[PDB]
Design an enzyme around this catalytic site. Structure first.
Site, PDB file in Angstrom:
ATOM      1  N   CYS A 152       0.822  -1.180   0.000  1.00  0.00           N
ATOM      2  CA  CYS A 152       0.000   0.000   0.000  1.00  0.00           C
ATOM      3  C   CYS A 152       0.879   1.261   0.000  1.00  0.00           C
ATOM      4  O   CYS A 152       0.474   2.232  -0.560  1.00  0.00           O
ATOM      5  CB  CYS A 152      -1.027  -0.001   1.130  1.00  0.00           C
ATOM      6  SG  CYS A 152      -0.337  -0.301   2.776  1.00  0.00           S
ATOM      7  N   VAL A 156       0.239   4.411  -2.622  1.00  0.00           N
ATOM      8  CA  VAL A 156       0.039   5.800  -2.211  1.00  0.00           C
ATOM      9  C   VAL A 156       1.091   6.737  -2.840  1.00  0.00           C
ATOM     10  O   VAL A 156       0.787   7.849  -3.260  1.00  0.00           O
ATOM     11  CB  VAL A 156       0.056   5.900  -0.671  1.00  0.00           C
ATOM     12  CG1 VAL A 156       0.101   7.330  -0.214  1.00  0.00           C
ATOM     13  CG2 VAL A 156      -1.112   5.167  -0.028  1.00  0.00           C
TER      14      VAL A 156
END
Ligand code: ICS
Ligand code: ICS
Ligand SMILES: [Ca+2]
Ligand SMILES: [Ca+2]
Ligand SMILES: [Mg+2]
Ligand SMILES: [Mg+2]
Ligand SMILES: [Mg+2]
Ligand SMILES: [Mg+2]
Ligand SMILES: [Mg+2]
Lengths: 522, 477, 522, 477
Positions: A152, A156
């Site tokens: 993740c 991002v």
């Protein structure tokens, strides 16, 4: 203290009086613990309808989820390809967890690398990590293919996997022809099953998009089979066994059954078996493609229909009697192979077992959870057995899926007291098994804590867990089981009926109290 | 193996790597030399892992949530970010506790904010505030909340300190923001440091001028025992039999009140140096509490530790110390008599996190076994200084060992037993090498203290001498 | 009373206060029952070493046997031949019991006839019963073969089967060429397994003794396989699968797997599958004959060695790792077929499972019973798992068998606390699990009463039953399981380790008492 | 089916048989006719079975040990002969009881003399005497012993009466010799008669001189209820609610003392006529106790039975009878309202032992079902007289039905449900015909009384309407 010829582990060591007294003094001295009567009061409250209503109003808090994150599914998918290293671009913490989670379920090695992105990548991105990572992984572990997903932090930060991989090749970190399919797998979208779909579609596109000009549908006379996220070895094996018995040519696309079951013969095998690169390259030449778990293969399906031009059949997961029948009839239609005597006999053996066990199964009430396709097939088979699936929970389900399950429920009298829940977790399920108590739970190892809670209210409130799903960590070798086809249905029926009869034995074992019904024959 | 054979093994293994990885990994592998005591002369540690080489390390969130905060039993710990981290770490670590789970204790539960893409886009602070109120409604006996940041929190610019302060003041509630995002540092190690600073800043000072608690001269805290399979309890019993009063356990079976009382103790007893030396130093600086390293693995170390601890007090504790040692003498002697002949001469390789790769060596030695290689995921050079004195001459040392390296070292050295983790276990079993999990104790333990040594011994023996190991080769091959 | 929307069967109906009060009144009024203090006193005494010593002095009384009578075995043997009717000369009550006993185990039809001899036959013998019985049986049920055994009244009055069958043919009741093999099967000799051996050797003789002069050992290039008394379908199937896998030509002599597993498809099939008459006639042309259960096939062995001139190999039942290896290595030597990759890999998967589960199995203590071959194979595999088979009971065992088992125990450190019992029953075993309490029992459904007895002393004394053997009446479809080969070993290992972990879960489910050790991962 | 069609079906089925078997079986098959009440004009019964035709019958030992004696809970019953008979019959029949098994009650145990060839040659009398002493030592709370003879006992000329007399006198104990050898008679039936005569001769007269029993006007005994799944308990409850006192139950949940007290009652209530009419007639002739047949299957028969029984007593019992009927009315009405629509018009064929093939018809009719065929293993013509009254016009009746006949009748008649035994169950399920066990109640029950009717209705419904029955046909055939 210990007696050397009868050494005690934690249980029952800490039940010795000296340990009990020590733990009491720790509590009373230093823990400032709520009084037991207050603990009992709050416990009782958490079992109530009033508490359930508050619990179901939650918007922000999740407690005891029944799902995981995308890259875990991408890793499982990638393991099903020959000599393929799963490679997750991003933070290394993730990969320790993915490996461990699968290690505990399969009791096997699980090979996966990270490219170990750190805080410094927030300035400059993860490109150098990708270059060094691919080169190092290829040299050290000698895979024939590296299948890339993301954590993740990489998502991002916004790293462009495609550009990074192309640049790795352009600058000579790996040979241009070395296969590096990829998929973006953000943990904040969907669940682990979405990661599986994303990874698969990335591998399918890698091997077929640019080479479609020479493909002819049906020219290889095979049927492609896509299994989805699948954690029972018997499920991969039973599908290949049924197609082979039928004389149907097939390609199973993502097949980890060998790499997740290597023999202990004195050598470690990092890779074994798996779908070949040639099978993926040749897949557009198949007659058609069948999706075993369609409710998490939507992206794959769009690619197979839009690019391969396969008329993917509208089939449910092949679980239970009706849906196994439908799967075999559709395969017969596509392939022109008749359903053979062997499978017709197996089918009638399952039906025999249903007639033999129906009296103990009838009207039994179940709570259950899992992934969408697994849950809907379990519901369907429970209705076929004359059971009532009263609490159906799919944390990672959606509205269109729920409507489909609600239609299945409405077509059967055994569905009248059933409710399907989506986006709800095992803290929600815990309330339901207090307020509307079923006979049993069918679920993964996280169910054991709900059984514990129910017993605390009283033996008469206890809801025993029957372990079918993922993960199963507190029993050994259940990953060898089957849940698909007639064989899987036979295994599920046997497990359920025998769970019912174990519990009845328990309740009737009391000498001169309940053992009037402790029958030898059932 | 001789020193030259080992050094040659290192060079052969490193041949596989590209030049940059080869040059790096050579710095993290060493052969112990009694002439060289300064580890900064022979091994580099606590650096970034090389991409793509299958490190065994985890992240800062593991180090903070999984290791330090997670065990505190009467607090609710939020895994703040997307669903993965909290699910994989739910009840994986056997930090044992007494409580009523879901009512007054929460350790094996997974509370999360389950970030969706909308939370990435708009931020999660409003969601965190709402989540705190829902926790308060549904878990009213919680005694505090922690917020364990996952990777996205810092990357999107959320302000969990502001939410913690505001909601803390609104609710008169201890709400601890922890910036343990897994992008930070290089391993679990920085998570411990971050976690210790969070305890310092948000909890430890709460009773600073509160003198309600009645202190005694014999008040201690067990610092850095996470009670794996009951390890802290089988330590505590001995300390209290010796006449000490264990005010706090950091953090296995730990309550927030006992953490808040720790500034009142007379002595901090540090088991895991790596994870909790930070707060130990803080408490010495601020409160004048001395701290000391000890070791409760095996009778030799346990006896030495009890004597050293008792020496800090008076003649009455020193007398009770000797009473304890005499009580347990026949028990551990019987364990040695039974199991040492079944294990002596056997060679062990270890690979673990930050303490046990040196700390368990004495216990192996107490059963006549020899540790021929050891290493750590995330230790620092101060750990390696300690390791070089516990390990034998010419033994193999490995920092942040790669999968490949570990496999190849094992194939050459051919240990009788390996002690490492869950990601390692099934590999070595297939090679026909007895394996014991030395994080989870393979669902056994405790291993600390005298009662723990019996279990340790039973366990090494059942696995090393098991009939399965004679059966891997088919008689027709 | 009943509430219509939740009807109660006996359990828990009779726990309603009105029924409880009614039953107390019946006891107090009319049963002249021993006082509860006296019942408790006697129960406690039945758990003692003192009582055990008296119990083991019994010479005349048998309580709760762990064997049945010869003709049961003859029936099961006869069912294994194509279109064959089992026929028991003698009393019809016996045949109702044989059918019912097997019906309850297999949950299937079990076809068998009597010739309904009555008291009048004690004047004149059963010859007319045989004549009309064979004619009536042949016309009505259209078998291709009638396999004749006897009940105890026929044996006591001394009916000569051979003469009676000969006279039935002489006088035209059945055709001369119609096959009517026979065996005397006295219930007061041996046990059900003895009946199997007797029946089999009778059938073998029928088809071969008079035609030996054209036979040549090895000329058909096959190996004969004799399974013995076998009540797991998986056991016939695994042997056939392993031999097929190896490319070994074989004949399985007595194969009831089809007739004990017919599909439920709208028709009843009285007969299915089975060994053909041609296979029995051609059997002397095999390379050799392998007995899977040698300790009850001694008569068969003497015939095969004396008449067929096959050098029957000295092999143990193929149970567990070493004995399956030995079976396969001997089949390889006889047939010249190498052991294939598929079986070598299966073997190594079993070994992998052993390595994965060894920590929970280690040192666990078992009481067990069954037939001699089954029991010695279970003992051997327990030793291979690092388990302690401390109470080993074989009611129908013999001294020579016990010596062999004692030799296996002496060769392993895990046999040091083990005793083998022959001629002892489950009332003897009950004493042993009180006086020298093991962790579990492995046995048949009659064990459930011993578990009941142990729980009555207290939860800490309860010895749970693990159901492996015959008969299993109180669980469904366990007859489908396997105990032979690597597959059976995998099934047995999985069952034992999960029984252990189920009990540990039970003992650690107590909230804030024992659930400190209620681990998610084991 | 018409009468003409049933008659033609009989003839067609019997074509398969040899002449002798054909002529015999024709006598045991009939079509019910309202003009013919005397069963001796239309069916033969209680004859030997034809050899080789797969009778469903058992033997006299089944009728004596299995049926009458075995349920008596506080006696030990010895299966005397070789090991088979006692093992096959161990806990096969669900004759429910309250006791402490192995201590004061022994029903589900298998006691046996396990005859070996030595016992055939020398006789079993010395073994039996030794066995009795071993029983006394190890089971001291037994209140009596029976000796249930298997086939060899009478054939070898043993004298079990002499052993019973001698050991009985020596030990001051009731020891009952039963000559129920399976060669005797043609079926279970003669075992019943033999068993009744043994009760008469060895047990029932014990208290003939004793006057200490406190009698009441309302004392009755339940004669011939073996408490299958608790059937006798859900009967007793109603009789006692009606103000009667049930002194004894023969023999479900029965004790030896209750049997000994039965000569003191005012009325014998006979459920199973076949098995217990013998002793009932004896008690009328010797003690002047009247007996009456009743039926507790379904509300219609239960209500008629309660009223007929109450009419034998005073106004106080008649009044309580009406109170019982009013209490249960809404309960069984609710069962009817739920299940009658789900079952009405469905056709049933039965085949059972000696009572139930007629006795359950009313309960089926209470749910709107029709019994189109019925028959018995071992009934006599007095049973068939009663049967023709219960059964519909032109229905099929079969005595000692052969396997072949039952299959072929079912194939032609195509009933919706079959109610029969364990040897029959799996055949008819494979044919796709719903089957319910009407001996064992398929491990359910009770079926007697108002509480039993709810369960019966649930059970016929769950099986007849089950989703499995639509699935036998593969959709590709
Ligand atoms: Fe890490 S530095 Fe890591 S003594 Fe504790 S989680 Fe030591 S339960 Mo797991 S076993 Fe000191 C650890 Fe446990 S060597 Fe291990 S990595 S805190
Ligand atoms: Fe036989 S004559 Fe036989 S009402 Fe009782 S054993 Fe009736 S438990 Mo079994 S069901 Fe009257 C009998 Fe049971 S029709 Fe059946 S054969 S004694
Ligand atoms: Ca494994
Ligand atoms: Ca069946
Ligand atoms: Mg039930
Ligand atoms: Mg957790
Ligand atoms: Mg000492
Ligand atoms: Mg109730
Ligand atoms: Mg029976």
């Amino acid at each position: 203290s210990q007696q050397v010829d009868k050494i005690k582990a934690s249980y029952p060591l800490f039940l010795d009086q000296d340990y009990k007294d020590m733990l009491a003094k720790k509590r009373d001295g230093f823990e400032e613990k709520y009084p037991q009567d207050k603990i009992d009061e709050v416990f009782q409250w958490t079992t109530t309808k009033e508490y359930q209503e508050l619990n179901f109003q939650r918007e922000a808090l999740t407690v005891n989820p029944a799902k995981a994150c995308q890259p875990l599914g991408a890793v499982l998918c990638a393991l099903g390809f020959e000599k393929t290293m799963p490679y997750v671009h991003g933070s290394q913490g993730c990969v320790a967890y993915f490996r461990s989670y699968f290690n505990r379920h399969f009791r096997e090695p699980v090979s996966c690398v990270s490219d170990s992105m750190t805080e410094d990548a927030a300035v400059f991105g993860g490109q150098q990590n990708m270059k060094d990572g691919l080169q190092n992984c290829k040299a050290t572990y000698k895979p024939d293919m590296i299948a890339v997903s993301t954590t993740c932090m990489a998502e991002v930060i916004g790293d462009d996997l495609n550009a990074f991989i192309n640049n790795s090749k352009k600058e000579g970190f790996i040979p241009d022809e070395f296969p590096v399919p990829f998929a973006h797998t953000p943990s904040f979208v969907g669940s682990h099953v979405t990661g599986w779909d994303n990874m698969f579609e990335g591998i399918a596109r890698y091997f077929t998009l640019k080479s479609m000009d020479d493909k002819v549908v049906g020219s290889n006379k095979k049927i492609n089979i896509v299994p989805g996220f699948e954690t029972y070895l018997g499920n991969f094996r039973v599908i290949k066994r049924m197609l082979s018995e039928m004389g149907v040519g097939y390609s199973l696309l993502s097949d980890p059954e060998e790499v997740l079951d290597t023999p202990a013969d004195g050598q470690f095998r990092m890779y074994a078996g798996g779908t070949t690169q040639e099978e993926m390259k040749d897949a557009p030449n198949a007659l058609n493609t069948v999706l075993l778990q369609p409710w998490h293969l939507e992206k794959t399906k769009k690619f197979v229909e839009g690019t391969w031009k396969h008329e993917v059949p509208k089939l449910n997961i092949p679980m239970g009697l009706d849906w196994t029948d439908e799967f075999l009839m559709k395969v017969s239609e596509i392939s022109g192979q008749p359903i053979p005597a062997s499978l017709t006999k197996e089918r009638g053996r399952l039906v025999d077992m249903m007639t033999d066990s129906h009296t103990w199964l009838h009207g039994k009430r179940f709570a259950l959870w899992g992934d969408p396709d697994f849950v809907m097939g379990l519901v369907k088979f429970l209705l076929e057995l004359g059971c009532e699936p009263v609490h159906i929970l799919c944390h990672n389900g959606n509205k269109r899926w729920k409507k489909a399950v609600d239609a299945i429920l409405a077509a059967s009298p055994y569905g009248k007291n059933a409710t399907v829940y989506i986006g709800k977790d095992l803290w929600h399920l815990r309330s339901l098994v207090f307020t509307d108590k079923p006979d049993f739970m069918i679920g993964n190892s996280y169910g054991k804590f709900i059984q514990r809670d129910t017993l605390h209210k009283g033996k008469e409130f206890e809801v025993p867990l029957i372990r079918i799903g993922f993960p199963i960590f507190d029993r050994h070798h259940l990953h060898r089981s089957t849940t698909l086809g007639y064989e899987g249905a036979m295994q599920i029926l046997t497990t359920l009926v025998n769970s019912i009869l174990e519990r009845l034995d328990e309740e009737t074992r009391g000498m001169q109290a309940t053992d009037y019904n402790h029958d030898l024959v059932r | 193996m001789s020193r030259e054979e080992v050094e040659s093994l290192i060079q052969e293994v490193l041949e596989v790597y590209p030049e940059k990885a080869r040059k790096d990994r050579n710095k993290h592998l060493a052969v112990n030399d009694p002439a060289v005591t300064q580890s900064k002369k022979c091994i580099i540690s606590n650096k970034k892992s090389q991409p793509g080489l299958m490190t065994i390390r985890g992240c800062a969130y593991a180090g903070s949530k999984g290791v330090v905060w997670g065990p505190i039993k009467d607090m609710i710990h939020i895994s703040h970010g997307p669903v993965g981290c909290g699910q994989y770490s739910r009840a994986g670590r056997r930090n044992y506790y007494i409580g009523t789970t879901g009512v007054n204790a929460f350790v094996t539960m997974n509370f999360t904010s389950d970030f969706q893409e909308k939370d990435i886009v708009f931020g999660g602070d409003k969601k965190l505030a709402k989540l705190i109120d829902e926790v308060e409604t549904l878990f009213p006996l919680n005694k505090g909340i922690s917020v364990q940041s996952e990777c996205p929190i810092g990357l999107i610019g959320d302000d969990i300190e502001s939410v913690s302060k505001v909601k803390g003041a609104e609710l008169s509630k201890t709400i601890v923001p922890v910036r343990c995002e897994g992008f930070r540092g290089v391993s679990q190690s920085l998570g411990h440091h971050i976690a210790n600073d969070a305890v310092r800043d948000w909890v430890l000072g709460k009773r600073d001028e509160d003198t309600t608690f009645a202190s005694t001269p014999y008040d201690v805290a067990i610092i850095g025992d996470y009670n794996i399979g009951g390890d802290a309890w089988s330590s505590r019993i001995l300390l209290e039999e010796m006449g000490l009063r264990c005010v706090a356990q950091w953090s296995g079976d730990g309550s927030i009140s006992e953490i808040e009382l720790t500034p009142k103790v007379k002595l901090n007893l540090v088991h895991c140096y790596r994870s909790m030396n930070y707060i130990s130093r803080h408490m010495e600086e601020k409160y004048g509490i001395p701290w000391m390293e000890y070791n409760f693995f095996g009778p030799t170390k346990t006896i030495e530790s009890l004597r050293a601890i008792a020496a800090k007090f008076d003649e009455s504790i020193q007398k009770k110390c000797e009473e304890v040692i005499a009580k347990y003498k026949p028990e551990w002697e019987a364990v040695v008599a039974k199991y040492r002949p079944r294990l002596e001469g056997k060679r062990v390789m270890l690979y673990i996190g930050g303490l046990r790769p040196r700390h368990v060596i004495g216990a192996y030695e107490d059963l006549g076994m020899e540790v021929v290689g050891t290493g750590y995921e995330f230790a620092h050079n101060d750990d390696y200084d300690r390791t070089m004195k516990e390990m034998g001459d010419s033994t193999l040392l490995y920092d942040d060992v790669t999968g490949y390296e570990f496999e190849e070292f094992v194939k050459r050295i051919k240990p009788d037993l390996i002690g490492s983790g869950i990601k390692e276990k099934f590999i070595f079993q297939k090679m026909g090498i007895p394996f014991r999990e030395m994080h989870s104790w393979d669902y056994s333990g405790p291993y600390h203290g005298f009662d723990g040594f019996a279990i340790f011994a039973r366990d090494m023996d059942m696995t090393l001498n098991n009939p399965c190991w004679k059966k891997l080769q088919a008689p027709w091959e």
